[model samples]
Target: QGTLIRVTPEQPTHAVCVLGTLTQLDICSSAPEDCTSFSINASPGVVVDIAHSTWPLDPGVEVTLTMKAASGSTGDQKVQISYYGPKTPPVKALLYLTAVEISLCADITRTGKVRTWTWGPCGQGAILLVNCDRDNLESSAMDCEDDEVLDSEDLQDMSLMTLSTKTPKDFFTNHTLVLHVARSEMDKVRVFQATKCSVVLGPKWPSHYLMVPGGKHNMDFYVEALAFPDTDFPGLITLTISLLDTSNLELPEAVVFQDSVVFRVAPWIMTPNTQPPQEVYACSIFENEDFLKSVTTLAMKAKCKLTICPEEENMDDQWMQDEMEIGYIQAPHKTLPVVFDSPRNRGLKEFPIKRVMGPDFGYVTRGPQTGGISGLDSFGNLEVSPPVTVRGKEYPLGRILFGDSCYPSNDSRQMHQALQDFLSAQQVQAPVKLYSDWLSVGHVDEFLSFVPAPDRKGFRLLLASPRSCYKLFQEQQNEGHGEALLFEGIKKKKQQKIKNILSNKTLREHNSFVERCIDWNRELLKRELGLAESDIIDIPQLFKLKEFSKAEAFFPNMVNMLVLGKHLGIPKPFGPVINGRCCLEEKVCSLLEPLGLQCTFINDFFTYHIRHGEVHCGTNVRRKPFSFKWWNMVP
Candidate 1:
């Protein structure tokens, strides 16, 4: 044979002719570059087939063929395989091949159909979740499933009236909530809450949904609630969450869910309800009758109710008749009530006081101690020592700023920490800055006074500038006025102090040091408290005194002015002219009038300045507290 070919059946075949059909196939002597063609032929009733018409004739080529009975016969007519060259296989004549048939049957069920869902209680209360769909479910069946629902671990709740954004908010007035709705298509979402008295909930944050990319009809959203209701009524409140599509305006469709919560009364708001005051109360004792009269006229001009704690009741009922109120204590200490808003007398009946720092004594010095509370034995140490009240919450007086030797008690710092701890129980913000260093009289009013901000809450600082005053003094010196004009209207004690300042080399050095100190304090306000330079108003203040001596010194001392409502009670400057003006009164007006204030000068030389005090040290202001409750005010 030209080609040696062999064959075997994949399955057992009773007939030997099955192998004969494949046996006659010819082998090529040289393998073709591409393929070799193979074919099979069958008898009339039998069928024979080759797996491939052309087979790769490479070194390692494998081919398969399937054969089965076509109809009636088991024999094939002929099978021929062609080749282009003579045999080169070295005459090995054994060829092998196999074939088989397999059949399998199975049954399958599709589990990828879309599922239906209906609204149902997730567990208790008004909580709801999409649940299995049911046929012929009655509305009464859904109503029967209602029950009391406690706040969930994921729910944001609020009950407190005084809610702020800064503090750690728990069940407070302001809250943020997150929700996951597993549905793909939604046009809009609206959420609101309602109490019995209030129809709509006031939220501080917005509620919006975000589409999920890889989920079937899924979305995520956040909602927030803040502020209190318009009216105060305690009851069950309902929060409604709505999913809506307004694609068809005529027939807008929506899916709504609701949750119910009982609003509890806030404990802090449970105080005794009292009427707010009509006017601010400014306090004064007739320590100097002339200075007290000047203050009374300014307070009346500002339309405030001036309350005097007269030392002797027999002195003046006419002062009371002329638009003034008198509250006579066993001993009249106006500074006690003036230092802080005394809780004992805060209501419509009495005007509320503003913050001040004062000593336990009636005045800064140990001149006279006459009051229900005997003046503590401290020089001018504890003046204006009011407790700290931050954002309506009161804290005991803590660390205070004073002159170097003006500390009241040796244990003042230790007492400060104890007072801080007692007030720390209420949780307060840190204290604001104070500018008190090595001055003779270390009252805060000596260098810094707070004036009313035109339309803003609280007040703005009025600072003292020794540099500005010294500059004015140099201008007067250049005009050849000498010591006469420089120390013009000042008394002998202050004139001697001024002559000492000009004569002594050490006093001039200390003046420059004080200038640096004021500059440093101004920068501290800017860096630490973020106060703009324009926020502080500078009033010219210059003084001369020995560091080791007990003698008092003076400035225009205008920085120690007192604020009474819309009016300013200031000391008439001892300097002849300010900025080369005819008078200091006009200069004071130019500086303060534009700030919407009316300045009234009291001749404080005799009573206050000579004694190393100013208008504020001798007088105190009981300003009108806020009319609205703390809860009603915005943070």
Candidate 2:
């Protein structure tokens, strides 16, 4: 009956499934007692049955057998009970070079079942061929015939040696000289078809990468030819080099490579002059707040801060007994008694709120004790702690949370704890990626770490001043141009011109302020390193970095808390601004007035806001305005 009931089967179906699991391992260099000794890696997903065909022992019977792995889930089964199964799929692997540099011609290959690779000559040069599971073959090859490679590699040893004739003569008078590598004839031999011996000359850009840490540039190459003494009354001997392609080495084509320098050839010596060149000086101005913001941005941009620990930082003691004395903010059951401090008599009433006027994130109470604005009292007493917001609701902020308005007054312990907490929180919000020196706030080595050398541009001239100095021009009521110019003396010329310009009463004060600004610049540069005491930036070194020059213009940002005082309404005069004093024909002081220091020196440093307008200098200075009291008035 079963044989009689045989029937055709339904449409055949196939299914593919895989059981996958992942594990992370490390790349270790040594063996240890623990599992950490070996570098572990993830194993590939287990490949079960990809496709299976169904067959029948009995024509009508259909049975399904699912394929499964020891650990992974099972794959869809095939209805093949009586017939032979199909062939299994091929296994796969990958092979590739970890790194290959033409300059560093190194051969690194891996040949294993998991990582199979093959390498051989592609056509002219050698190449590496890689494959995975014997499919999708990939190739990566390198060419070494480039000029940079030939002159540097394989022939380096031969090129570095000095070739001289058997006779110890001052110069080579003969036209023929043969230098052979091997003791015998024709073994790696090189013939120099030169007229007379001359010292070799190579190009150089000492100031390029040589002076700077990472400067890189290319210099052209040429040979020097010397004059001949024999036979001819006066003649020059020229040398020619035969260019050869690495491929066609049998016969090379020689070309006339002319030399730029002709030598007398008294001595065949090559000595390089390595004196350092003069440093270049430059000046730049920035907005006050923009400058501050740029500096702050730099701090955040730093990967890490570098710092010099104070000899008295007392790290161990700072953290020790912090919990018991200050009620650690992080500890369980930490309660701070909110002290309502009211210093009845002390200068508490005169507390200045000006510091908090600007858009500040928050503040930390500074001082030793709790009671009032002045934490210290005539009589010594311990100060209580303060309560502060850890983080803001929307945007992240610095540890500005420790202001005077909090619940408990801030003590040293509380401030320290708050700082740590705020920093931890900031990490989550404002992650500092690059700790650079620009973020340094303060450090013990702030002043001492400076590396000073002779001013490259003589005095290393720089200009620092308040934004109000420039704003004065912008404020003039007339629609004229605002003029603030800076000029410098060059080639030791025009000493009086610069001195006269600097001596102007108004300009002298301006110069004094500008000069004083350098102290701020130096301090700010140091602060960039000591920010948060996080030792992420080598501030002194960052100044040397090329990027430091292009650091965002921050002068605009420094305008914070600054307001220009009203002018007394007096007018001042200026002189001609010279492009270069060295070229000036007039030596008259009147001619020099226009080129006055106020006009030239200031103009040299700052940008001029141009518009013709009346400049109000101060009140009139005629015989000094009297205070009061008529001079012996008749009664």
Candidate 3:
């Protein structure tokens, strides 16, 4: 008689076979080399492949088993297998079966769906966007805080999570799939389940979710990031999905199969000028209609969109660029433009958060409550350099550049420490500190800008140079135009004779000090960005000391310009007229045109220039993002 070999429950020594969702169990071949061919039989729910009834069918072939229905898992039905060698007798082994299969996955590589995840300058996981924009115009709250998704267009910003399962009948009653995040990440993210009502899994309510189901069905979930990476959060978050067994009421529940995915919340990225601009922003408040018309013409000339803030909302504050900077956030799936409000809040204080946020537009601001805030807190003081490589370390997303006091490195009063920590924590763009405390307004846009170039490095740094302006005036005088005037037709003050302007020893001496200050920044830029001498272009511009030490543009700041792809909105410097064209205009055209840049001189003299700002300070631009994936950078 064949030797009885029933897998226990039959014998206390034998084992009961348990299979958890697609869990593979090895069978037969217990005698090792002696067993050449093997065959196995599984209960109703279990599945096994028998190739030619020879297992691997290649001698020493091992047999394995898995489950399908998850039904019939009472451990009574047997899984039977037999081993045979051509010259030997057969041996048998039996198993009592239990089965279920589960798989959890998400977009771990941004290349559709996948099951694995990794961190650090490597393959990307799901990218989460801070739902800072309002989906519906009538809604009073941002999408991140809203309990309902009012617009269909809003769904694109959320990342996808998938949970797949196959369990036995009535398995869901005693068991469930729990979806959750670590306690530390509660405030950083939220998960949304769409039912009759949108359920928010957040810091307060619904700490964990019992994943809903249709038997053996795969489930999908939508989620979003709640905040930008700041001092308290690094932007990276995790979510865990577990097959929970709650069969025993007295004992603690056991976790069966657990899976998780990583998410990096999209950072509020500042756009470099080299990126092509899609739209322009400006505010009209006075003879500002003239400025708006000029900007309107410039926008039309550049074929870019335009939005001019009316005098009502602008409310006496015409420095649109100072009030708010337009930048954007992005992910592998989508991108959103956001207005970053400055701590230097004034007349147009509510513009960014009030009117600019709607549909896909976002708004974020770092404000001060108790401490003193200066002009350095303005958005005009904020800027980002184009892509650069220093010592072979490429910053594909570029480094963030901001004006701060360098002498007192410990002052901590420059831009609020709150904003600095938020920018630094993003990691993709490292912050670069440059000296800008010398100017009255103390903004980087006052003295420097970046624009696209067709040649080496693909862009050039444009720095306002008093020396270049003085040199240009000297060249004009030597060329027999000493009598030429600078402020040609402005009625604000007396028209400035270029000849007389240069002849003044005190004005010249003050700019000499101005020249030294800018030169210090010049050297710093070259060192930090690994820029060559040829990579920068010194724009002809002069500055004057207002009260005593703080510098302000004497006429108009030309380097502070609006760059819209190849077209530029440059402040018209009414320099000495030579052969019908302003020598300042002629010299700028000759230098920038070769790089495929088109200069449009906008007459912002009385309206903006008289107010101690220029075309750039009164306006802003929102541009496209880089095509390069941010996670690829080693920062």
Candidate 4:
């Protein structure tokens, strides 16, 4: 009698095997009376130590097999066991293994099948947006807080993730699909299903599984990062999807194949004054109400929205620019404007986070941890240049410009180390530092500013020039206006002659050092901003020194003006009025008005200039973002 069980690598007749999939196993339910129990074994790429050997094997068992892709080596392993009657010959059974294609992709370069992840200039990866805007005002919180994507505008900011699976079908009931992230990256990102319900995808422990939807079809998802890459984080995150087999529910699932993709959260960026003004903010205190009226007139002409902080909120702090800086964060999906609150911690310190951090407006601040601050820590020390190309490299986002001072090179009166580190880490807008300690106010804006111009570079760097002011006075003296008196019609002030100002050796000497200091930054701005000599305009202004050679404005500083597009609010310099206009004001108009800029001189001397600040120092502006994308620039 020929009673036999045979095994082969093909199916239907002699038991078959597939290249990348495990064989569907079945045992003969009714055994010959003589066959009682059986054992099992495995080969090179296969693992079957699971029960080792089995007895009382009537119903049989589902084998747990592990396999990986290597083209099946010459010393390949196979799994099989044969059963027979106690007194008869052996019956045979065999199994085979194979691999299927799976991938996690994005619509980065060309959508569809962008599987491999990359970085830098030529790298392919997804961009994650911070959901920092208010789509629904009723909630009063940003959209990132909600699990449901309520608005289409908010959805547009999220990255689209695609998954493709390939095989005959869900033929093998045991196989499953899974999406996962690294253990350390959980808080940095969030993933959601791309449907109306908008289910938040997370595992109560994932790197978990999903049921196979179909054969070779794509499943979609959306991704978002929770925060920007600050001093605490690196910002690059990777997402992965893996294949697993769950043949037996009693054991842990076995992984088969995996593919991954990468993502980066966009950085927060700063705006320059030359950009169109969105809003202006100033403080209205008891003694400065007159100054507020002048600012109100200028604000009306600029046609931009203005918000004046009442005395109750400001507690009489007139330095609005010193409290906070306005900036924005952007990504492919969304853009959000925010304020960087200063660590100055004065009366207006709480206003930014308290009143300004609602809805679409976000707020951030940092302490040195041990808590050391300086005048340089104030927002008055912070500024950015107009977009320019430096050495053939483009800073479409514009470069960040600020300042520092050194005493013994160790007692550095500079921006907070933590804040500077955060600014430099963004990488897009490289920073250029200048010296600002010569001024009693110890801020960069005291001497320099940028204004919109229709000429050479589309903008001009304005530096307060004592040299130019003296030149103007010398011309007046030569033209027989030497008797033209300055500070005319002012309260208890003594009037001085144009010739006296030109002849005062001590005042001339004090401003000589001021000119040198301004010239130092002039060259720095020229080189760092890639400007020619014509790109700068020197405004006629003078500085005087106090007890320690600390410079303060002798006349109202014209360079420190609040820029609202082409309209400006300059501090009214009470210089010698000639030809029916203040000569100082006329000189400014001669230089700037030809470029279609509005020159409105606001009287800020008593309440502002005497206190060592001017119009720009007392007011602040929030500007529109640059039209260019930051990622396009090579940082």
Report the number of the highest-lDDT candidate: 3
N/CA/C clash count, model 4: 10
lDDT of 4 by residue, 257-341 (tens): 5667877777778999889998889998878888887777777877778888888989878899998998887665567787888
lDDT order, best first, reads 3, 4, 1, 2
Which regions of candidate 4 fall more than 4 Å away from where they truly are? 1-103, 110-123, 132-157, 162-173, 193-220, 248-252, 368-370, 406-411
Pick out the ten consecutive residues of candidate 2 with the lowest summed lDDT.
616-625
Model 2 per-residue lDDT at 474: 33
lDDT of 1 by residue, 1-635 (tens): 01123432222222222211232333343333233433233333334333324443333343323334221212232333332223332212222222111111000011111011111122111111111011112221111022211222111221111110111112111112222221211111112222111112222222323221211121211112221111222211232232232334566343322222222111111100011112333334445677778877876676766655443431321111111111100100011111211111212112211112122101011112232221111212222222234444442321222223224454222112322232222121233334443554443445665565564323455777766655555555566544544445655743533334445666566666666656766775545444566667777666555654322344558876666655777887755543554244665677788877788887877665665666655554333322232222222
Give me the overall lDDT of model 2.
0.19
**Candidate 2 vs 3: which has more TM-score:** 3
Residue 42: error of model 3 in Å? 8.3
Q: Model 3: runs farther than 4 Å from truth?
A: 1-97, 112-122, 195-197, 209-214, 369-371, 409-413
Q: How far is candidate 4 from the true structure (C-alpha RMSD, Å)?
A: 10.0
Mark the 10 consecutive residues where model 3 has the least summed lDDT: 1-10
How displaced is residue 40 in candidate 3, in Å? 12
Candidate lDDT values, in order: 0.35, 0.19, 0.76, 0.74
Q: Which stretches of candidate 1 lie over 4 Å from their true place?
A: 1-287, 313-415, 422-429, 433-437, 453-459, 483-487, 490-504, 545-553, 577-587, 627-635
lDDT of 4 at 73: 23
* Candidates 3 and 4, the one with greater lDDT: 3
